[PDB]
Amino acid sequence: KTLWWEPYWYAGFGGMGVGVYLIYHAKPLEALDIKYWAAPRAAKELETEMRMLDKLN
Amino acid sequence: GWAYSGEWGMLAGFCFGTLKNVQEGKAWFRRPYIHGAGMIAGYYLFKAAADWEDEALKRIITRYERKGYAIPEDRKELFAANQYK
Amino acid sequence: MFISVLLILFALCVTLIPEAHYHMVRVWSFVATIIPMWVVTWMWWNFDASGHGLQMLVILGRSHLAFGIDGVALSLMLLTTVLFPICMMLLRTVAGFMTFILLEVLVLSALCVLDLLGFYILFEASLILLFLLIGRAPYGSLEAAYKIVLYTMAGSLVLLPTLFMIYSECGTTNVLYMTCAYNHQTVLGWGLLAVLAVKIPLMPVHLWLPEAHVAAPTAGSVLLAGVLLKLGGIGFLRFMLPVVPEFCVSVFPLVSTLCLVSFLFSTLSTLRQIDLKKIVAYSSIAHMSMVTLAIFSQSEFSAYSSSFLMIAHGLISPALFLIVGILYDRAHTKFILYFSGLGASMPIGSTLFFLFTLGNLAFPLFPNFIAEVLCMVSIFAVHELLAYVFCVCQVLGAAYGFWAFNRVVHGLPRGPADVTRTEFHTVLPLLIGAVWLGIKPMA
Amino acid sequence: SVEERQSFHDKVNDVFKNLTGEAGKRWARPDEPILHTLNDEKEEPHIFFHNTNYRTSRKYINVEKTKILREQALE
Amino acid sequence: YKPEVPGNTVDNWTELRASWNKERASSLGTNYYLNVAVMGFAYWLNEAYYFPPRTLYVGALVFFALYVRKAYFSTPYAFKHEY
Amino acid sequence: NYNFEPMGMGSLFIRTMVMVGVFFFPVFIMINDDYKYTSFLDKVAAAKAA
Amino acid sequence: VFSGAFNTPSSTTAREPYAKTKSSEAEYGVDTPVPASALKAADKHDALAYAVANAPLIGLAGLAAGAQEAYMTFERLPPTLSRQHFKQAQLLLGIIGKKTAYATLLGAVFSFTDATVENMRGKHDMTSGMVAGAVTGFLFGMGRPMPQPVAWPLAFAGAAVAADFIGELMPKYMKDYRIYGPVVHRENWGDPVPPRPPILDTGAAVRPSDPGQFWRGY
Amino acid sequence: HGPAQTPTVFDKLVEVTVVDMNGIRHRVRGLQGQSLAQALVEYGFPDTYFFPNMGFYTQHIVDAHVFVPKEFWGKVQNVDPESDDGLAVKRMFRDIVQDYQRDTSFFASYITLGAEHNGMTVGIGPIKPWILHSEWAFAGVHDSRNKQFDKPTVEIW
Amino acid sequence: XXXXXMIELDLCFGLLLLILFGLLSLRNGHVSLAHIRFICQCWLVMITPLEVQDFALCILTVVLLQSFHSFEALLFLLLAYIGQLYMMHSCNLVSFYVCLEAQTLCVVVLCGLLARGASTSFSVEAALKFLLLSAMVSGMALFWFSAMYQRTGSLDMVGQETFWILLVMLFKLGVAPMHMWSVDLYGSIPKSLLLYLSTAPKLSLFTFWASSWHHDFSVGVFILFSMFIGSIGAYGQPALRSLFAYSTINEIGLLLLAVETAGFHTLYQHLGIYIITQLLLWNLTDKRLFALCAVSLAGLPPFAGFFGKAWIFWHAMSVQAFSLLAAALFCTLLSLVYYLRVIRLFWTAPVHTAASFTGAPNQTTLTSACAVALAFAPVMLVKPFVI
Amino acid sequence: EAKQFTPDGKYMPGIFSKAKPLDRSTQWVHKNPYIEAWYYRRDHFENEFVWNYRTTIEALWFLGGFTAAAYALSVFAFRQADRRSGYPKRQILGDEPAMVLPDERQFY
Amino acid sequence: AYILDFLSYMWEKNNDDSASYKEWQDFLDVAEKDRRRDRIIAWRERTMYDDYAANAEEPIIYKR
């Protein structure tokens, strides 16, 4: 016999886990976290500051 | 006046009838005429409360300005308003 | 807001259920707590880390009640909404369902509050609920409820004059304007320190918790362990630092020394405990002190580290309480000298006891390890002496932990057999969550 | 003066009340902070939040730069 | 498990009976006297409110300290035949 | 043959101090570094104003 | 507002102090006259006069307590003893006088020692009150069992510290505190200026510490 | 477990001679584990023979004033004079009894009858007038026929 | 012209008609007087001026008239209400004294008459004690009033003599240590009369204070007396009657504290909340709601007692009355002990409610359940409402 | 040996079964009176406090002494952190008006 | 895989920056309204209703 609580427990917790996986693997990188938003914007600044440093040498 | 005052009054009347049946050992849903009358009473009473807030606020702005405490018109709208907040 | 009101009314329908159909009673009571978990999941899917530091803003007119979401509040809501269904799974009375529903509602409302008066009103609305919960007639202790209620009321009464004084000073009670006005930081700061040092267990005024969390049943025990202490940390983060920084600064030596002595004495006191439940009670004190010092450090990433540690404790410690509750209910006693040979008697349960003991002891492959690493990073950047003090006494907690575990688990087999399907299911969310957050918490 | 600061506060409220942007541009991620002559910048909350978000962006950009330079150093 | 009540039952009951074989008078007189005292001398504290807080708190601590509880009040004078 | 009694007060105090000294040496090292540094500054101040 | 990176108010402070905030059109207080005896009571240049003028208030509490205990003892007197009116009077009056004199001595000691320390240290702080409280507790606590001779000085010293904190320290810390009109350091917020301070019929216990707090009277 | 005799009420039967304030002896049957005053109510004593308990969370408990002879003094369960329950008992002495106090004055609510109590004899102790609330008071006169056992409830309110 | 004084003539005519009507109704062998009760309510409605306080007191009394069934007591309550209403209009100490003494005599008579059972003797004793102390207080008031009349030569209520007028005003509210008469009254008198006392004279005296009273002194030491004594006594008294008595003493001390720092809006709202609670208290038939009164008195957040104490604390801080604010906080804490005790005594208990036998089946369900709906009040309350 | 179930499930309470029914209380221990007294005493150890010589000596030398040690250590760490960031003296609680919260707009 | 980017596109379509900014502005505006109103109301004198001088601006009629 299946216990009374088993289907509801499974449904709720599996739904939360599915939502978690979909958040971590389908939300846009910028939407998921800020750290993705800043990488392309900082890469160019680092690029153009590297030559500034080299000329300072 | 508040937007949902009458709904709050009806909910209060609902609980009122519930606890009236509680106080007599009856099921919560018995005697629905009491529920309806209480809903009407709560709706009208809290509408009166909402209107009384506006009355008191107009009294406040009038008294404050009459004493000599003149206000820039921008904040007078905080008191001279029958806002349906 | 509309959805929240719908859940509020839907949860109240429990009392309207006639007691004849017990099956549907359990189903409804469980589902009412199930729904907010999915709602918070939907919120997290709706949040934007590239957006503002606050999102999903809503205000209920001139009635205070300012609700907004940061990462800390959302994570705390997620952890609480995970915890509550397990607590529901451990109750058998409608009164318990109603009390825990109201407690969950109050916790959720306070978790995203943005009005200091609103936090004051909403937080301590559950004090009578805790009083009725802890001092139950057949098994509870009235003294524990008396203690905790008096401590909380004392804190709130100390805070209230400060709250109304700053309200009059700035003309409002919203944080985003309280944070922008000049104010007499000192008095409000003392009020906030008093309340959040009572709520979070901090020496000397912390003594209610060891009696309270032990006298309460399993569900209330897990609630008190994993929720109400974190109300203190989110309290700091949301209110005290944004509002009164100068008081926070001038009190930093006092806060640091109080946290350090709290941690030291609690760690040393734990070894002399003779009951598993009391041992678990003292365990949380060190974690809360570490969280408080991490918050007050503000060095590099203090808020995030504190949130990580709060989540880690609210994940692991309820598992300790679950094991304690299972052992007591299927043993009718909590006294250590009646526990022996548990591994041969309760293989999977004893394995879980081991795993969650290691979780309490900050070991790798667990969120607590990264949490304490980040907290000690924040502490170290402020100064290295405090970080050393935290680092040096790591052995002293694991001492009592391993001693109690080995004493009760190994040896002569005597007592209950292993756990049941319901008990393993109750254990399951904490294990999965801890593994997930100790392997790849971020991405 | 008091009247000068009153006028400046009113102008700031006007400017922030009528402010918008498009083309996938996320507000609270502005390219520039607004220069000011205001002591205790919290005197203007809008400017305070603008500068807060700019500072957050700069800090996370520093973190990303640190990661990139760490990768190059490892290489 | 139950802890034991300390001491002897006989001795403790006798202590329970210490200074209680006496008729209770009417509470009217104490009430009238309190009201009379308030009506007659409370004006003495009129100048008090301006006084420095330190002295007022000292007076408050003294007044609290010297108080005697009306309930369970007993004297050796209740059961002696002469002064 | 055990009486279950707390340790000797003086011995307990002495061993507690011994433990504290052995296991909190960085505190003393940092404090003595600061003391030496301020002594250097004091000598510099004394000699530089004459 | 809320990010895990840092806390913005921790780095947003003023560079220059502000001037005085204009509160009302008329910027002077209105208050009732203080009796000069209490004005002499605040005088602290002479310890002897300070204690002398401070004593009667302190001894009044002892008088009240003595009257309480004496009347309670009376309401239990036997009929045989109550007819010795002279003896009744002498006993009750002895109780009352003992209590009142003890209270007076305690208060005189407190005031004398407090003003003594105030003159000795050439400045004013809470330490003088701490010394006075400790001495008063010791004098009160001498000759009793021994959880007391430490506790009573602690009680008196803590009471003195609380008295300082409440009566003097906090109002001085909030001498500029205002609940009306423009907010200090935030007069850019457009709050109108009242012509006059809010007139309030506050009791003698509620007195304005500053001319700009409110107006007291009717 | 063997031929052990069937359980009958005789084996737990306790008898106490109780004499009223009018000097009339009365035979009363008592049971082990129950209070004396409960049986006293069960006998038909007038409501004037009883009074509310003056303690906290016990004001629903009735009691009667009796005198315990010298022998049975040690069978009275001990109560701490320093305890809050002891304070309630001392309030009961202070108010109800006044100058009716005797060194044998005791309260039946603390008498748990047993084997030794068989054959014990006590009498009723006089009390002063009292009032608790609107529905339960004592005029000071023992002129009544209403049985305390006839009250449907004990309303502390 | 008397054309502007019609309503007082109406009061007199209605009283005469009521006297004759009551006389006639008694010759018929009638045994109930609900018709008389409704007629009295109507006459109260008509004689009421258009002030908010006047209507509040009128309606409060109107609900209270359902709790009595004797014609003479109805008449006494009508005359006491007349005295109270005209006390809200008393511009001089003569009418003030007359109204106070009429109310006192009415209270004494009402307490004396309605006794039944063996409780009668103690009710008589308490009533006589209150009469004697009221007589001496009245004599004090007359003496000092005559002294003021001599010094001023006018009807102005000013000068040093007003201190004793303030004292007499204190005595009517049971201001500790002039509180014990209230405790004695709580000890014996039936619940209906105590229900009357807690609401009406206090309301009228607060209104008259707010309208026509000023003094050049403080009452803070008396506030300390009331707060501390009420808190400690309500903690220490096992009797429910005296427990609520000392609770009332603490609440009136809180009201006095609100008074001393002005800001009568919080005073008004807290008085209204407390009167609502008292109305809910003395007509209780089920004990489950009894703990709601405690949580509405212990200042627990979600209900009105908390906010009523809260704005009071707000206004106390508005003047930085640190001393009395801290004292009020500590006494509020001490309240919680016996309030939780009340909760234990009448919440964690088996549910039982006796059924009516002589008809009148739970004759006060409506007012009870209506007063219960106070959890919905804070919605309208949190805004600047009462001001 | 009892039958608390039917051949098709259907848990039977077995109220009138002669055999002792297996239940939740089945594996309860038999309490040891000495153990119960010990655990009550340790849960109610609060009645054993007294201001003796040893207790006072221990409380002052350890509790308050190490409280003072940690307080002074915190003060030292705070001041050293201030000195290691180029800041002047800062105003701790009760330290006379001085610099608090160094501005983000100033280079120290 | 396609499901993941489908969800991403659904999110990006549904979300709006300007709506959130307007919500933020509404929050600040309402909060400032309430704070201004409360601060104005705080200028609360309190004298007895017989105080003619303190209420010389009140249009009150007496029937005495």
UniProtKB/TrEMBL annotation, chain A:
Q: Which organism is it from?
A: Chlamydomonas reinhardtii
- What is the protein's name according to its record? Uncharacterized protein
Automatic annotation (TrEMBL), chain B:
This entry's Enzyme Commission designation comes to 1.6.5.3, 1.6.99.3
Q: Which UniProt keywords apply?
A: Oxidoreductase, Ubiquinone
* The keyword Oxidoreductase belongs to this UniProt entry's keyword annotation: yes
Name by which UniProt lists this protein: Mitochondrial NADH:ubiquinone oxidoreductase 10 kDa subunit
Tell me the superkingdom of the source.
Eukaryota
What Gene Ontology molecular-function terms does this entry list? oxidoreductase activity
From TrEMBL, chain J:
Assigned keywords, A-Z: Membrane, Oxidoreductase, Transmembrane, Transmembrane helix, Ubiquinone
Provide the top EC class: oxidoreductase
Q: Spell out the molecular function terms from Gene Ontology.
A: oxidoreductase activity
What parts of the sequence cross the membrane?
Answer: 59-78
Q: What is its EC number?
A: 1.6.5.3, 1.6.99.3
Lineage, top-rank taxon, reads Eukaryota
State what protein this is by name: Mitochondrial NADH:ubiquinone oxidoreductase 13 kDa subunit
Taxonomy, top ranks, is: Eukaryota, Viridiplantae, Chlorophyta, core chlorophytes, Chlorophyceae
Range within the parent protein = 35 to 142 of 142
TrEMBL record, chain K:
Q: State what protein this is by name.
A: Mitochondrial NADH:ubiquinone oxidoreductase 16 kDa subunit
